[PDB]
Each structure stands twice: as structure tokens, then as C-alpha cells.
Amino acid sequence: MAMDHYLDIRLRPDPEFPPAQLMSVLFGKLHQALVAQGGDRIGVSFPDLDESRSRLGERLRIHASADDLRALLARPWLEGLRDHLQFGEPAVVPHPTPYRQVSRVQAKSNPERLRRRLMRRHDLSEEEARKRIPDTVARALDLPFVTLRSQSTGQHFRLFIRHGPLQVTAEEGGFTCYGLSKGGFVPWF
RNA sequence: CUAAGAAAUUCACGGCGGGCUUGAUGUCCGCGUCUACCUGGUUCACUGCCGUGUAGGCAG
């Protein structure tokens, strides 16, 4: 926990979008700025969620610095949510701070994924494909997120994600492109 | 302690033949239904993605 980039921000109310109706736009306007724009000294955390309540977004919680995340207060790439949101700037963090566990990982729940794999790897079709394939091992990761409707359909798909524990020690460096800890202790202030 | 107490009705069969219901007719007349709006139900709690084995870049 060497960085001291805590930038808090709040929400804004709008009538033309639900939580997914701006969460899919957040997934569209954060990943490309973290990919085509990029920056390993910039990301996000998830320190204010819950399991049963399904709290996905409740406040500004980012991880930046004096130069890498210093363009998070003069950025016209996030312009348009002035009817539904806002942002802040980084503040001086203290010595003893926490570090929450998160992950922006991909969970898979295919019970017929063995059949779609064997269609190009085994030739075992759907007729005899119920002998030893995983019928219920492909579980679902139920959690609250936005409903990103890709070309498969217009319905709101669930945003699977795994939380983590809380350790007093920290780990500075780099995480995945989504900000979830792929080896690095994520921030939770 | 009951008008108490008891009991075998048996057997058989030809209803049958006939027939003109007819003819007539005006249902007329009238009408303002009127205003109002946000499905991305998740047209599967996830399709389809490197290992059929629990870690992942994707149209998110």
C-alpha cells in the first residue's frame, strides 16, 4: 500500500436508465479507456459490496497517482454522464490503510461446453454426450452487475465476479485490465 | 318381555289391421363512447470462445 490515490465520487439520478442501463455504458466507457488509453498506474477497486445485497456500485473508489491517474480530473472521455454521475480527485492517504480482495475474472457455467468442445475435439455429439460430461459442474456465479447485451441478444446478462478476503499487508504494482486482483492486493478504503 | 313367539305362491301366453291437415299475410322508427400513458421480463441466473479436468484474451 505505497500509493495514496483515493478519489471519491457520488452518483446522480436520471430517469432514462436503470442500474444496468448505466452499468453497461460504464463497461463500454471504462474498458477501452483502460485498454486503448490504458495505464498500469491506474485502475479501480471494490471495497463497498455485499454478497446477498448485491451492492455493485455505491461510491467513487479508484486507484491512481500523481501522474498516471492524474488525468482523472481533466478527462473529456467520460463526458455524458452529467445527467447520471460525477467524479472526484485524489487525496492524501494515511500510513495504515486496508486492501480488499476482488477479481474481474470470467466465470464459466457451460454444462454443454464439453459437447461444443468435443464437436471440434472429440466428435462426441449430443446423442451419446450424457455419459461422463459435466452436467452440473458448470455452476453460475450469481452477483450484481450490469446487463451488457452483446450480439447474442438484447437481454441483460449477469455480471459474474468473485470477491476476496481482507489482509493488513499490501502489494503495490499491476493488476488486470479490469482492475480486479489477478495477483495484486486490490484497494478497499 | 313389544296383538310377543312361526311360515316357499307357484306355473303358461301373437293385439291386430287402415288412413291427404289445409289455406293467408309490410315490423317499422332515432341516436357523438370519451380521455390517458417509458417492457433493454434475464424472448435461459449466462450463450458461444485455448484442456472433455474447477485457472482465461472475447459481440459484453
Swiss-Prot record:
Its EC number is 3.1.-.-. The keyword Nuclease applies. It is an enzyme of class 3 (hydrolase). Disulfide bonds: none annotated. Disruption phenotype: Infection with phage DMS3 inhibits biofilm formation; disrupting this gene restores biofilm formation despite DMS3 infection. Normal biofilm formation in the absence of phage infection. Loss of production of crRNA in the presence or absence of phage. Disruption of the entire Y.pestis-subtype CRISPR region disrupts crRNA production but does not alter phage resistance (possibly OLNs PA14_33350 to PA14_33310, plus the flanking CRISPR loci), indicating this CRISPR is not involved in phage resistance. In this bacteria, Y.pestis-subtype CRISPRs do not confer resistance to phage DMS3 or MP22, but instead are required for DMS3-dependent inhibition of biofilm formation and possibly motility. CRISPR (clustered regularly interspaced short palindromic repeat) is an adaptive immune system that provides protection against mobile genetic elements (viruses, transposable elements and conjugative plasmids). CRISPR clusters contain sequences complementary to antecedent mobile elements and target invading nucleic acids. CRISPR clusters are transcribed and processed into CRISPR RNA (crRNA). Processes pre-crRNA into individual crRNA units. Absolutely required for crRNA production or stability. This is CRISPR-associated endonuclease Cas6/Csy4. It comes from Pseudomonas aeruginosa (strain UCBPP-PA14).
